[PDB]
Specification:
The PDB classes it as motor protein. The entry lists the keywords DNA uptake, motor protein. This protein is α+β, with helices and mostly antiparallel strands. The chain has one domain: Glycoprotein, Type 4 Pilin (2-Layer Sandwich). The protein is about 25% helix and about 20% strand. It contains one helix and six strands, in the order αββββββ. A six-stranded antiparallel sheet has the order 1-2-3-4-5-6, with helices on one face. A hairpin with an 8-residue loop joins strand 3 and strand 4.
Length: about 120
């Protein structure tokens, strides 16, 4: 049970690691220590590891200092949790849903429940 969580989380969180680089752009922009480092990560992930990566929430692209990074399980049953990426390099694991999968892989979902801080 619990092993599934961390394994599945890690898997799509690897895809969110792409988003960790995307949000890292933000880190590198907001905190420029070395100017020689040019950095443009662009998220090509819409779905990965049975979860979907979408830009949704406060924005749908880099606008302010906030970077919308969301991974939602296509199947909220096959996968009870959701993986959300915040600019703090932090993951939010919720049993709730924080968005929807526009890829139209197989299934859609809409449930709210428990949340968790993953740092």
């Amino acid at each position: 049970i619990s092993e599934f969580e961390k394994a599945k989380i890690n898997a799509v969180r690897a895809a969110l690691l792409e988003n960790a680089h995307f949000m890292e752009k933000f880190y590198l922009q907001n905190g420029r220590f070395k100017q020689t480092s040019t950095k443009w990560p662009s998220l090509p992930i819409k779905e990965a590891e049975g979860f979907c990566i979408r830009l949704n929430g406060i924005a749908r692209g880099a606008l302010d200092s906030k970077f919308m990074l969301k991974a939602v399980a296509i199947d909220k049953d096959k996968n009870p949790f959701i993986i959300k990426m915040n600019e703090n390099l932090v993951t939010f694991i919720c049993k709730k849903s924080a968005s929807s999968c526009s890829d139209g892989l197989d299934y859609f979902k809409g449930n709210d429940k428990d949340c968790k801080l993953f740092k």
